[PDB]
Paper text:
The polycomb group of proteins (PcG) are multi-subunit complexes that maintain repressive chromatin states by silencing the expression of certain genes. PRC2 mediates this function by methylation of lysine 27 of histone H3, a hallmark of repressive chromatin4. Three core subunits make up the catalytic core of PRC2; the SET domain containing EZH2, the zinc-finger containing SUZ12 and the WD40 repeat protein EED. We have previously shown that the EED subunit of PRC2 recognises repressive marks, such as H3K27me3, the product of PRC2 activity, leading to the allosteric activation of the lysine methyltransferase activity of the complex.
Residue numbers in the entry:
A (entry chain B): 77 to 441
B (entry chain A): 10 to 182, 211 to 216, 220 to 249, 257 to 345, 422 to 479, 516 to 740
C (entry chain E): 1 to 11
D (entry chain C): 561 to 685
E (entry chain D): 22 to 30
The structure:
Amino acid sequence: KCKYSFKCVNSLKEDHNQPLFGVQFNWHSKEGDPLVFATVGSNRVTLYECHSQGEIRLLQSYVDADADENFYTCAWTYDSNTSHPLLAVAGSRGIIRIINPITMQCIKHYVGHGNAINELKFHPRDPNLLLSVSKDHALRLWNIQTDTLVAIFGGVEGHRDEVLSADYDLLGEKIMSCGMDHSLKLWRINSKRMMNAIKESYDYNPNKTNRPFISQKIHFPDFSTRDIHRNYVDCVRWLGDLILSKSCENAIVCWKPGKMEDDIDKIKPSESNVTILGRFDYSQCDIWYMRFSMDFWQKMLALGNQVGKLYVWDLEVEDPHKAKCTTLTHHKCGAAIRQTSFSRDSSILIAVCDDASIWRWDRLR
Amino acid sequence: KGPVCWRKRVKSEYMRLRQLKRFRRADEVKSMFSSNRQKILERTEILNQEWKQRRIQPVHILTSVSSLRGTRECSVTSDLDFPTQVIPLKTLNAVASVPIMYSWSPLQQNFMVEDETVLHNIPYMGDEVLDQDGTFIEELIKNYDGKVHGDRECGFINDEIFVELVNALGQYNESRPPRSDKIFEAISSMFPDKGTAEELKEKYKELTEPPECTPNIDGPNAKSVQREQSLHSFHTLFCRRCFKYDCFLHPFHATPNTYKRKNTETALDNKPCGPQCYQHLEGAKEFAAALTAERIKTPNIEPPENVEWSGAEASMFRVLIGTYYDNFCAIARLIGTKTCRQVYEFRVKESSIIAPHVYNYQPCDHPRQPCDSSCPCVIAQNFCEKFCQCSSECQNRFPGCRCKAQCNTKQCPCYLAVRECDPDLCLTCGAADHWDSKNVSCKNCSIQRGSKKHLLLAPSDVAGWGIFIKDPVQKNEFISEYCGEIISQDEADRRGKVYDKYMCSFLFNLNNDFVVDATRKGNKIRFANHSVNPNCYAKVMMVNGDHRIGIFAKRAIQTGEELFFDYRYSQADALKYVGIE
Amino acid sequence: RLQAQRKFAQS
Amino acid sequence: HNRLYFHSDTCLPLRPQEMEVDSEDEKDPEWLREKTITQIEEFSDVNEGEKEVMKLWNLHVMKHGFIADNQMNHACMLFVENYGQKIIKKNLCRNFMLHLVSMHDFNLISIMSIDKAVTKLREMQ
Amino acid sequence: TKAARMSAP
Ligand SMILES: Nc1ncnc2c1ncn2[C@@H]1O[C@H](CSCC[C@H](N)C(=O)O)[C@@H](O)[C@H]1O
Ligand SMILES: [Zn+2]
Ligand SMILES: [Zn+2]
Ligand SMILES: [Zn+2]
Ligand SMILES: [Zn+2]
Ligand SMILES: [Zn+2]
Ligand SMILES: [Zn+2]
Ligand SMILES: [Zn+2]
Ligand SMILES: [Zn+2]
């Protein structure tokens, strides 16, 4: 048959009715602490708390003073010294704002990008390393501790159009990115050049020197291909050493650089080959900017489509897939589902929509 | 044979191959999935442990002190029939926005770029536009011959599958082509992005595949080789104009009379080497002079010394005689591991073996005949240059200037022809002068020397980003070159359609053949805005065989002024904004 | 054919 | 004063202590240097070999910005003063001689500079 | 088709 089963315990709708483009559970909270998630839409970011059973408690909501600002994405981190949770939001105006919910104040802002930021990510091992990808065709890596721009991942072999998504690997050693140009580009950050640049970002102090921090500028990815997809690529995730990415092709494709045998850490930039291992079939997702997510243990994969249908897949399945996916639909959920988010435990599955609706799905007892 | 019958058979063959490869790979991928799941498990565990050590005190909420009624509220409604939740709204304040900029690589000199026949991206401007007017996207695809990556009936293709398809095509076919020319047309139709068929034909050859090559002279495999083969790579790949190998600015190869040199000079008598030199019995200098005199037309009583000649040594000898012409004295010193006597011996052994509007400038090489109405230079209405392989005294060459000093007036023939001085011809003014102190008596060589002024990036008072000059400059002083990619007029038209729709273009016309595009890679002056009353002007000067754009001050310019120049448009595409104050 | 994919549904 | 200026590579603002713009002399783009190395290696049918000596030369002329032919005598001399030590490590001595022969064929260097260069190279052997 | 381009005399 199929796994896993959920039921829709609650649905809530925000007051602006603008699309919610991002949702993120706070996976940083210690176990035994309530499951928190954030949503970004319109010009505001709002925080909610999940309580048994089916109740979602509205915790906090912040708005940008600029009416034109529109948030697209958010991501969670912590300040390892005071141990607070920290939330970052970025959007159309191309500015990254950092909300500290304990202080309920915007402590930091970074405006180096030329255009809208499509996605945000945090380093698994380093909470101060924030990766921002933009419509200006660039990825930027920031050290939020020293307020320094570590590196810019754009240039001659950079993306030709908007960068839509990026994802660190589990270990934080490499980045995979994708964008409108149809290309997925691999950027290693375990190289000496990068490891050293991060280290120097920490040592940087503006009160100590008249010079600016010299941000490394990487014009050349360690691998690149346009042979996977045939249109804009809007979501890319690392599945172990394999890549999961989607296009307006109605399937999430699981592929890898090189020939079947080739190790990911033995891939040279000139490499021509990619190998498709398998596909995750779906329907009626033709619009771009439709993201999928996974749970922490990467056992289940979730993607909402544009007609309010969510698909959930089992990543422990042997062979295609093909079959089979568990599909859950609701009669009042008809708008497009921009993003999903699992809680740290796989118990809850949030989905957010074009019509400002939020949908809570819980797992089996 | 049928034109659609090949494609039909190709499509079916492609479907059949994709199947069995996948049926076979399923075995491997299933093995790889488990392996990958193992890596996932280990690494998720390492992240999970690191999480256990951390305590974050998350999930706090605040209401107090009670709302003062001057704060807006956020309301969320629920299907669950629970009462609606209302929270005060916390404003995020006062972050300045930076003008829009798409990323670009920096350049000091222009960069040659081949035309791209298929655009690999459809610009997204149109969701807010709501497709109107859509004819623009349709006409945009017209310019690429309807070729976008990837538009095709078939779904997936990769190098591994592509080779198998060509092989399966070859076996399908009577025999043999051996490798078919008709077929690359058939699959190029199924794959507009992969086409043209000849590009596929070259790409197939690339993947399939060391003759003809010359192994390393400095190598374990050095072989005895003729002088042309040993130099075949340096001659064929070196650029005479800018002195690099496989340069970024000049597409054409050797002429190839340019690498041929004068046989002289000076064929002189030099002796002794010495002392273990090639002497002194008849045929030392005599048989040598006889052999080269016998070879040109169209003794040696002592026995030669017994030595062994390596591949490298012989090939190097064959190279050195081409350039030193029987000066065995010098050959032996450079070969180093042989002596003047032994070089001569080898030459003697070798002799007794038996063989079995403005147009972009390009050099002309019609070796004996003169530069007349058939010469491409005069056809083009351009002077011949130092790069031309014509006569030293060709009437169509440009002489330099004999100026004393700055030669920034019409009296300098260089300046008057809208040409910068030549460091190889303008030997009096100082264009040839000391390179390191780059400010020099000749003020007509700034573009060659990149003597550009310091420019400052800041939000324009006029539009988006603008550029500002740090320190003041006087009238007609050189500010900077307008660098960028160099592209054909056709390629500029395709890029232009999208730039015009986007409403901004960094396009600058160079000459009939090429346009300079500062969009993807360029330099700081690219941010200069348009103004009908500008403070700067543009000269397309001709610089050492290249056309280069120069931005100069039309007037005296004070510190921190924003620089503007007249674009030469009709126009309101879309400025429309000149000028403030 | 293949067309430019959009960000939102028609209505 | 104050107009606020920004860096071109990195759109971060320019603090008043940094400008002082710019003491550094412009420029050689680093990406161009990496492009050339990766482009030479791309050659099917070229010596290892020949590629390495070409890469060294390309980097050398790019670094100093040679415009003229009269510079090429001084250029071949500099190339041993700076890259000669690395040429000996890689056993590129004879390909560097081929380069000198080529450069003479193209009419850039005097023949007295072939000997004068191999002499200086072997003088540091 | 004539994409706008900058010019000089
Ligand atoms: N005077 C002017 N008024 C309105 N737009 C201008 C302008 N001068 C330049 N531009 C815009 O800039 C393009 C030239 S590139 C000049 C840099 C640009 N102002 C920027 O901020 O990035 C033009 O196609 C136009 O879109
Ligand atoms: Zn060149
Ligand atoms: Zn001698
Ligand atoms: Zn001539
Ligand atoms: Zn001629
Ligand atoms: Zn000529
Ligand atoms: Zn002159
Ligand atoms: Zn002059
Ligand atoms: Zn002069």
